[PDB]
Amino acid sequence: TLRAAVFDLDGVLALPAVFGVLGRTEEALALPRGLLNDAFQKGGPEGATTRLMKGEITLSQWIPLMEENCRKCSETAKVCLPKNFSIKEIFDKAISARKINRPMLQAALMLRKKGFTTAILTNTWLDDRAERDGLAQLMCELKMHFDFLIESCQVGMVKPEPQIYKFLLDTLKASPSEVVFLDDIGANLKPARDLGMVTILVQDTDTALKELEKVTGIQLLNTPAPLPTSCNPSDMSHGYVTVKPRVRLHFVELGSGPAVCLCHGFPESWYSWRYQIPALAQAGYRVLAMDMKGYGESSAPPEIEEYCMEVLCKEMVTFLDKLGLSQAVFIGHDWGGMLVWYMALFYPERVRAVASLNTPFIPANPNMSPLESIKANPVFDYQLYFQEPGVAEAELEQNLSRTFKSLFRASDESVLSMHKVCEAGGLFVNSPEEPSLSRMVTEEEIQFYVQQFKKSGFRGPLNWYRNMERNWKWACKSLGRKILIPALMVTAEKDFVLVPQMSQHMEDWIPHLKRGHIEDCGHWTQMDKPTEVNQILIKWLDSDAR
């Protein structure tokens, strides 16, 4: 039975094949057919290209040797190369033009999810060109999705040499009949076949995938749309900043570019952004996914007053100070969405751009106390259950697995009703002991939340709801202001607590506000509709935040 799938890079995982630019160049310049391909392979094993692929020389050292080979071939063919001929120019264009073959990567990702060991085996070079970063970025994006990356220039061996296949088998810890090997070069498939490996000659992706699906017996073509890449906690960069003597903030960090600070809601974690972190980094941003104060690896002091909006925002500013960041784009959800609007109102010089998922911006009413506002707004009735220190803590902390399984549900999964919480005496009074697992999460993901909440529990998180009056007084100071920095409001159709219509008057205070809207999306936006969230955020980031 097959248990490993091996992919070539050029012409298989990446297209157009850099190799194929030689052919296109010949035709575009009306040079003899095969002239450039012949100069490329000149000398075979003893040649310049083999030395390059084995790692003996770098790509910049190879270019002049390739030029001499082109000159030799043209002389023998009795043709002239045009005056502006440049191997560097041809290869820069070719490499930069080459992109990930998304359907091939999708198939590799599927096989890996089904228990296959996956690997990339490629004849590649040491790239020291001024423009090498483009290739480095491509290799980075691709390689993360595989168990092994075997580069000829690193192992000092090349396909079609037999030792590289023995090397591949050794790294896979697999016998040849357990391996499917995909390559676009028939000569490079032959040694894999000779050992008894299943081989696929890749021309068009579709036929290659049909052959692959048939041999593995796993559906790879016409598959449902896959979810965005998630995060494995143990594989992330974990950052820690002390903002004040007793308070430290934890964050996960990925990517390069403008800083994007992700602020989760109640009762969540940095992990609620798992589907956003890889996509935003890939989009050219430096992501900082927070464990907000009271959560996960961040400090959780007991005092209610430590969780008022004024102190929480102050600490986020210190956070930027300590990291040496003059600004960051702030993206928040739920309680984090409330915090991000306040960062825009109080610290606009530190906020590159602001985006909120579900949480609307509603100015404080100076003529009505928060108790009175809730009296006039019964949808927020349950928040009075969160008020008394210890009551909601005891219910939420009783059974952690039941807590997360009850809360984290899609709109059609019998979501907890927030109406009647006070009348009924708790969040879960009409909830089962052993809730079913929502399609949004795996059991493992639930256990991650359970493990995180074992450290500090629900006290610090519930404290975010315990500063109504303090937050109201501070918010009233900002009543004459308007939010004039770049801003995005993302509404979720089926969030019954943070309803889209609650955001309807936002333009009065944020005139240049941009909007996004997600259909059939409940409260847990990021995991409910990850693909849609990613598309809305990236589009807005690229146009408005930079």
Catalytic residue numbers, as ranges? 334, 465, 523
Q: Which is nearer to ligand 6N4, 266 or 474 (CB)?
A: 266
Q: Which is nearer to ligand 6N4, 101 or 359 (CB)?
A: 359
d(CA 265, CA 333) in angstroms, rounded, equals 5
Exactly one of 52, 338, 396, 533 binds ligand 6N4 (CB under 6 A); that residue is 338
Exactly one of 124, 199, 205, 359 binds ligand 6N4 (CB under 6 A); that residue is 359
End-to-end CA distance of the chain: 49
Q: Where are the beta strands (DSSP E) in 485-525?
A: 487-492, 514-518
Which backbone phi and psi does 302 adopt, to 5 degrees?
Answer: -75, -30
Identify what 335 binds: a copy of itself, ligand 6N4, none; CB under 5 to 8 Å per kind.
ligand 6N4
Exactly one of 91, 270, 273, 335 binds ligand 6N4 (CB under 6 A); that residue is 335
Could you tell me which stretch among 15-23, 149-157, 195-203, 332-340 binds ligand 6N4 (CB under 6 A)? 332-340
Q: Which is nearer to ligand 6N4, 215 or 374 (CB)?
A: 374
Long-range contacts of 108-113 (CB under 8 A, 24+ apart): 108/5, 108/7, 108/13, 108/145, 108/146, 109/145, 109/226, 110/218, 110/219, 110/220, 110/223, 110/226, 111/5, 111/216, 111/218, 111/220, 112/5, 112/145, 112/146, 112/147
CB of 359 to ligand 6N4, least distance (A): 5
Q: Is 205 annotated as a binding residue?
A: no
CB of 141 to a copy of itself, least distance (A): 9
Number of residues that bind ligand 6N4 (CB under 6 A): 8
Pick the closest to residue 460 from 299, 248, 335 (CA basis). 299
Exactly one of 407, 440, 462, 487 binds ligand 6N4 (CB under 6 A); that residue is 407
Do 344 and 354 form a contact (C-beta atoms < 8 A)? Answer: yes
d(CA 529, CA 145) in angstroms, rounded, equals 22
Long-range contacts of 85-93 (CB under 8 A, 24+ apart): 87/63, 88/63, 88/129, 90/21, 90/25, 91/18, 91/21, 91/59, 91/63, 91/129, 92/129, 92/131, 93/21
Identify what 136 binds: a copy of itself, ligand 6N4, none; CB under 5 to 8 Å per kind.
a copy of itself
Do 290 and 363 form a contact (C-beta atoms < 8 A)? Answer: no
How many other CB atoms sit within 10 Å of the CB of residue 102? 11
Q: Which is nearer to a copy of itself, 154 or 436 (CB)?
A: 154
Q: Is 92 annotated as a binding residue?
A: no
CB of 130 to a copy of itself, least distance (A): 9
Hey, is 275 helix, strand or coil?
Answer: coil
Instruction: Specify the DSSP element, H or E, that contains 239.
Output: strand 237-244
Q: What is the DSSP letter of 319?
A: H
Residues at the contact surface with a copy of itself, assessed by CB under 8 A: 51, 55-58, 60-61, 126-128, 132-133, 135-137, 139-140, 143-144, 154, 156, 234-242, 253-256, 259, 281, 286-287, 321-327, 346, 348-350, 352, 477, 480-485
Identify what 266 binds: a copy of itself, ligand 6N4, none; CB under 5 to 8 Å per kind.
ligand 6N4
Q: Is 10 annotated as a binding residue?
A: yes
Give me the numbers of helices (H) and strands (E) for the chain, helices first please.
23, 15
Identify what 349 binds: ligand 6N4, a copy of itself, none; CB under 5 to 8 Å per kind.
a copy of itself
Identify what 480 binds: ligand 6N4, a copy of itself, none; CB under 5 to 8 Å per kind.
a copy of itself
d(CA 457, CA 449) in angstroms, rounded, equals 11
Binding mask 262-281 for ligand 6N4 (x = CB under 6 A): ---xx---------------
d(CA 404, CA 42) in angstroms, rounded, equals 63
Q: Is 122 annotated as a binding residue?
A: yes
Q: Is 334 a binder of ligand 6N4 (CB under 6 A)?
A: yes
d(CA 486, CA 512) in angstroms, rounded, equals 7
Q: Is 172 a binder of ligand 6N4 (CB under 6 A)?
A: no
The interface with ligand 6N4 within residues 482-521 (CB under 6 A) comprises 497
CB of 112 to a copy of itself, least distance (A): 17
Do 402 and 437 form a contact (C-beta atoms < 8 A)? Answer: no
Q: Which residues are annotated as a binding site for substrate?
A: 382
Contact set with ligand 6N4 (CB under 6 A): 265-266, 334-335, 338, 359, 407, 497
Annotated binding site for phosphate: 122-123
Annotated binding site: 8, 10, 122-123, 184, 382
